[PDB]
Symmetry: D3
Subunit: 306 residues, 6 copies
């Protein structure tokens, strides 16, 4: 039971493609889904081993009923919108997800071209984001991003679907959200004030202790224990993007999870707040402009089509 | 006389910023100009030595007259539109060029942000391009790009203004064009046909021999010799850019010379053709959508 | 759980293939070297980690196995079989032992080779010695990316490693080697599109030709075999270009591993003898086999207990 | 059960930190143990992938009883002095071990500063050693060091506690000894004589054939078989260190095994000898000045405090 | 065209600083080493190329010059001039010989250090041994980027190497070393804004503060000196973090190279004595000098020819 | 003003030496190649930048120079002088053109050598072809670090490049080639100390032996030469291991550049003929020269105007 490259080595370029399937285009999409792995190799092999090109393919809830006629994954539903008192997490269209990652952008682009070449006439692009990491694993806010991601075996258990849905083991659920930042408001804050928003030191990336960590900080609200006192983790690979001329500076959120319920819980706590926290302070500097949910099947599920 | 980093080592990433100066923004621009060099140091230093972060700052003909007074660079003028029978080389506004290049896209972005943060309210963005190179130094047409660029002392003599304009020694002229490719039409040709368009082999990057190479191939037309039989040369740093969603696949042309004469002859010879050739066949798969000319002064000129 | 030899090696840029016959009397010398080869590998390799990626796969032939070991024989161990095709011939040349030596540098290969041969002076006669170099973009002598469609991960393990079919020799594998000599003059007279029709993949971009344009007699068409069930049968290749410019000798060293030699043997049959659909493999019109040998490569454990 | 980073990729720098816990500093220490992995991530994450930063936390027999009640690991005991006819392996105080590794020494120091930062006023430092490895993987004596360390699965089985002590599976036993070399004496030997001392060729690092190898060579005396007939292996990460001014040229021995018996048996043969060998010839040029034993638990054990 | 020592090193990440005093009788031994020092560098360095970047700069003190060499003395060679500031002292401490060893890794420094000190045993007494390490993003012990404003290329050469104005010692340089111990506790007590105003640069972005926003008792302000004509007097520095986490030692090792010592000295006067506008350099409230020494580092030609 | 060939190449770990004689009537083809040798260098090399470090040094023999160009001859150009010593012999062998191809990868060397020879077939005859690799620690086949005392920077330019003494040929160099075969068996019967006394340096640490212990017939002793003015005379070497374990060939490929071949020949004489205090060079008791040629390597622009 072989998963896709969900658990990728640290990459520094990425392309996010989000497309909707035009009416009639179902067959063309199916043809591509079976070749996506072959196209990964076709492009990636001659740059190996330093390219680390990998494409993760996601399918939406509505798209699934169009493409496959059999069983559905148990967790697959449309992205749930969140009307918070102050902050709103929108749901935007998107039937397919192409999460492409590499050491260099051209490998991402090359593969992105191939995929879209096939899909021409069959799909409509909704979003396309060229991401780049800030050489010290920092995001647009200037804080280190991905410190707390699970690794090794914790990663496998947190992300890959298992025996709880045996027909779809090796799969994962992906949530994507495009955030825009108000760098103006943000850089108008003191470095200590920023630390209260995130819940970690800016330079040293040391976590604030519980004596000091405010309850409405990002790390406070995304820290979640389950019904059995153990931590619920997601796998994130946030990527900066933007455009100096247009004044756009963004974080592209993408979180993988064994079940959508984990990442949905965190999302609620951020947007709807909790007992002590009205919302995640990060949201006063971050507007989500997109929001979608995808199932990323096992690699052989895609292979065993055409 | 210290030049800007016009002779950069090979970089895999780049940003091209073109801006106009808003009316009454001249003073803000002058302050920035005497700082570029030190922002370059600030941003790029802690990513050394692998960073290779360099910005090159250009000034358009009109912007020069608003910014400075007195003697002007001999060959500084706005880009000369070319109206050929088939193809056109368009001129588009642009007062300042920022040619930012690093081994990493994020160093470019960090430096662009600083520069732009200090020009805010004083300039209008005209063009912004985020450029990457293919792993094998190929462009969007799949051919190796930059092989016949000059190196070392040959480049220095070809790009740097010297004694023919002593007041502006250490400077250079940069011509920029944004080109979009009709990839669909390109891939319609066979390899051999495509080779007769460029004038070099695709795979091996070997120049076609003279008794094969069309008079209308790109390499045939952009090879110009002067009256003493010397090769007239420029320094190119073509970067591919694109958006897969919008089917936009382009090459961002930038050429550096000691005088626009050189670049401009090549341009004429490409768009308007010669006695043998109607036009450069590469233009049959490439539309120029921007065109601008800048003077890239000596570094010590900016630090005043 | 038996530890196999480094059959599944990371990509390496350099290789030395060394093929010897055991001189009469030399048995016990060989028997001593076989048990020390794992050690020698580490000796030469360790001080150059992790860039070195030095490994040595040691293979034993059918007739030499009877000279060396009392006991059971690997199920599929036999002398390489000549194939007398209408047009093309696959010759069988003598070989008792294989040393497939792979590193990122020719020198690490040469130092291990020097050490192995140093221990075997006067026990063996050299049949073949090839210093191979991969091109920077993973391309072969014909200018095509070579290795694209190799199995990776669990696919590679299940494809190459012997298991329950022969429990005694679990973790073993089978190597078929062939030295090919190319007619580069003829090859370069073909157009790229013609060369594409010979291989079955696009030259520049290394995309498989689509099932509907792929000629029946292309390399890729004839080397794709399906199993009883319809599981595409797989081998693990590590072709290496080798050459002498002054002798005008442009070559590809073929080595392929499988769990059973019959998979490889099927493919050779189809290449050399042809099918109803294909006269023979078009790659043979530009390639001549000048050697052919077959070896079983036992698990590391097997070599250590001698 | 997720274990500690005992099986590290090769690193070129390391810091070894040995402390004892003062009276009443138990709680300060317990708070650290539960944060230590998150400190490792905090300092190490942004240096990835080059960084290869990691820290292994060991606890001694003494400190275990102060810090935890309940079950003790099966093999955890104080380091035992060996008083050979000639050579002495000393025992020296040490309750906590920090084995900190990276490609760069700054990362090590960064992490160590964090750890001790939290421990200020609770622990007394017994030893601090900044290690570096030579570029061709040679040690202070000039020989490639670490050639025959097990890798992959062999390493897993030799190093990690399993079914035999199931409440501590994923834990490990680390033995530590600070050696100071007599370089003058050593450099007086010819290459050939030095090889006779070690057991392997100096330049090529090829092992000497059993036909030739002395029985009091280092390789001879540290080669151990079991009743199973299987080789008994440990994992080492010996590190050069010193100061040219004080003429201190050393090797810092750290060895990991799934049980202390293996390490102790190797020590026994080196210091007390066999029938064939009076002692390990390496000791004629090497003096142990520290000696401590630690149990390095599974990570999730430290996390669950 | 005399060849200078490797005063202008590529960026190096490790360093050993050696300061020794020459014992009674040690002249002959020292003179021997000085004549062999450049070839010892090559003996240790060459087999580590090109990653090694191992180099050693050798310096001779004022009192030492006269014990070693009859004849001309470098123009600005004199003992370190102590500065007894109203508040802060810049101490002088003994030193006849300096060995500034830099490489990409520490082991390479140590090996050279062992070789040098080996030849010198009995002839010298060590005063100071510092093993230095730069942080991965060129930060010092105070968490600020350190090196940004160093000159490079033709600027550095003009700034550092002796020329026409002292023709016999053209290609030499003047090195000043001081060991600084930090009160990290005081420092880490300040806000990032506070710290930024002590240095005069932004902490994360390393952007210089604007001239009228930058305090006059700031470090950048006080060490910015214009000479006769309103051009910047430059020096070349390679400060190395060092320390010990047990003894709570956290230090900068300052070393500065100049064409003439007057430059470094003017900068020191301004730091310790102050100006009209400023009492003393604010960095000095977090930093205590514990050593102070001046050396002339001659051209390699000079050392070679004795 | 005059631009040389890449004589002063950085460190490369792979090389190909190609020696060819020019057939009767082949002169025209040869001249055409010479004018394009730079194009082909950029054609093979550019796509592999920056890592490839591909370079080609073309040299021409004395007898070949006469056939190829009328006009003045490099002052120092002449056929290699046979040295018929009492024990050892430095044989002269035919060679009209030398292609010294260096890169960080052998495959890049092969690709350029293919291009050069492709244009040359039917006009030249191969005399020698050697594929060189350097050990990871810069060691030669004798196990000694090789190249330690080679000059660098300015010093290397003074020693290598023809200057104003031959103004027409300013920027050229003289290259001497000798292919040596070693008696490894004999060499390995010596203790390290005995070997050390042959070379004149310590094996492991590569420290030059002190003048007290270093024999007068050691390799370093005999290849150290002072000119009539007391300055060391230097050559630039790039010795490359080569060989074949099958045929017991263990070699050193010797190439030495000098601004005048007189420097090199001085060294060859001392090696082969000896001095008062030395019968011959002890290295020769373990090394046999099988080839011997001398070529002039012109300025790059000399070849461009053909
Ligand atoms: C559509 C955008 C363009 C593309 C994709 C392109 C691509 C190429 C390629 C593949 C080559 C051959 C390899 C090499 O770089 O040496 C080349 C050569 C060259 N191009 Fe272009 N080019 C473009 C536009 C231009 C323009 C506008 C100019 C001048 C105004 C120019 C000047 C040159 C020159 C001077 C050469 C080298 C001539 C020689 O081989 O001696 N290019 N270009
Ligand atoms: C003359 C020497 C040979 C050359 C130059 C050569 C070259 C290639 C190339 C370029 C490919 C396509 C890229 C790839 O998938 O790796 C390929 C695929 C392959 N070759 Fe060969 N090959 C040679 C001999 C052989 C032989 C003798 C066999 C079998 C006995 C073989 C079996 C295969 C297989 C199984 C594939 C993959 C087929 C697939 O796409 O599923 N090759 N080879
Ligand atoms: C004085 C400090 C020490 C030094 C410098 C040292 C050095 C070496 C060297 C050079 C080797 C050969 C290369 C290798 O396989 O790693 C080696 C092997 C080994 N050493 Fe040591 N060693 C030291 C202390 C110890 C101690 C105290 C032990 C036992 C507790 C030990 C156990 C081993 C083992 C087990 C091997 C591998 C044996 C085998 O070949 O299977 N070492 N050591
Ligand atoms: C306590 C030890 C010291 C530390 C930690 C330190 C740190 C720094 C830092 C962070 C900078 C700004 C970034 C840079 O340009 O490198 C700097 C700049 C500088 N420091 Fe220091 N420094 C120290 C001592 C000294 C001393 C003793 C001198 C002079 C004798 C000196 C001269 C300079 C100069 C000249 C600059 C650059 C001036 C400019 O901005 O144009 N430093 N130092
Ligand atoms: C049999 C082939 C040869 C081998 C294996 C060899 C090896 C070496 C070695 C190991 C060194 C010392 C390390 C170094 O400085 O590079 C050396 C130095 C040198 N060799 Fe050779 N060599 C050979 C042939 C030659 C020949 C034929 C010449 C002269 C024609 C020569 C000239 C030199 C010179 C000038 C030095 C440096 C001497 C100095 O320290 O100033 N070598 N060689």
């Amino acid at each position: 039971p072989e998963p896709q490259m969900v658990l990728s080595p640290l990459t520094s370029a990425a392309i996010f493609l989000v497309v909707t399937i035009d009416s009639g285009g179902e067959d063309t999409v199916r043809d591509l889904l079976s070749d996506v792995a072959s196209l990964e190799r076709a492009v990636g092999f001659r740059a190996q081993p330093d390219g680390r090109l990998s494409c993760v393919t996601g399918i939406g809830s509505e798209a699934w009923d169009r493409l496959f006629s059999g069983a559905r994954p148990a967790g697959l539903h449309p992205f749930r919108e969140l009307d918070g008192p102050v902050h709103r997490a929108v749901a935007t269209p998107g039937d397919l997800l192409f999460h492409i990652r590499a050491s260099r952008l051209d490998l991402c682009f090359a593969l992105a071209t191939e995929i879209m070449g096939r899909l021409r006439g069959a799909v409509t692009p909704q979003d396309e984001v060229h991401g780049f990491k800030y050489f010290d694993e920092r995001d647009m806010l200037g804080f280190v991003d991905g410190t707390e991601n699970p690794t090794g075996a914790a990663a496998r258990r947190a992300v890959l679907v298992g025996a709880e849905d045996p027909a779809f083991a090796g799969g994962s659920y992906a949530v994507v959200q495009k955030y825009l930042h108000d760098i103006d408001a943000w850089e108008g804050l003191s470095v200590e004030a920023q630390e209260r928003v995130i819940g970690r030191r800016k330079m040293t990336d040391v976590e604030l202790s519980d004596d000091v960590k405010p309850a409405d900080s990002h790390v406070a609200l995304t820290s979640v224990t389950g019904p059995d006192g153990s931590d619920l983790e997601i796998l994130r690979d946030n990527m900066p993007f933007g455009s100096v001329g247009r004044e756009e500076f963004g974080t592209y959120f993408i979180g993988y999870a064994r079940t959508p319920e984990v990442t949905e819980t965190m999302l609620e706590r951020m947007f709807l707040g909790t007992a002590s926290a009205p919302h995640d302070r990060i949201l006063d500097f971050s507007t989500a402009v997109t929001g979608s949910l995808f199932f990323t099947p096992a690699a052989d599920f895609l292979e065993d089509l055409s």
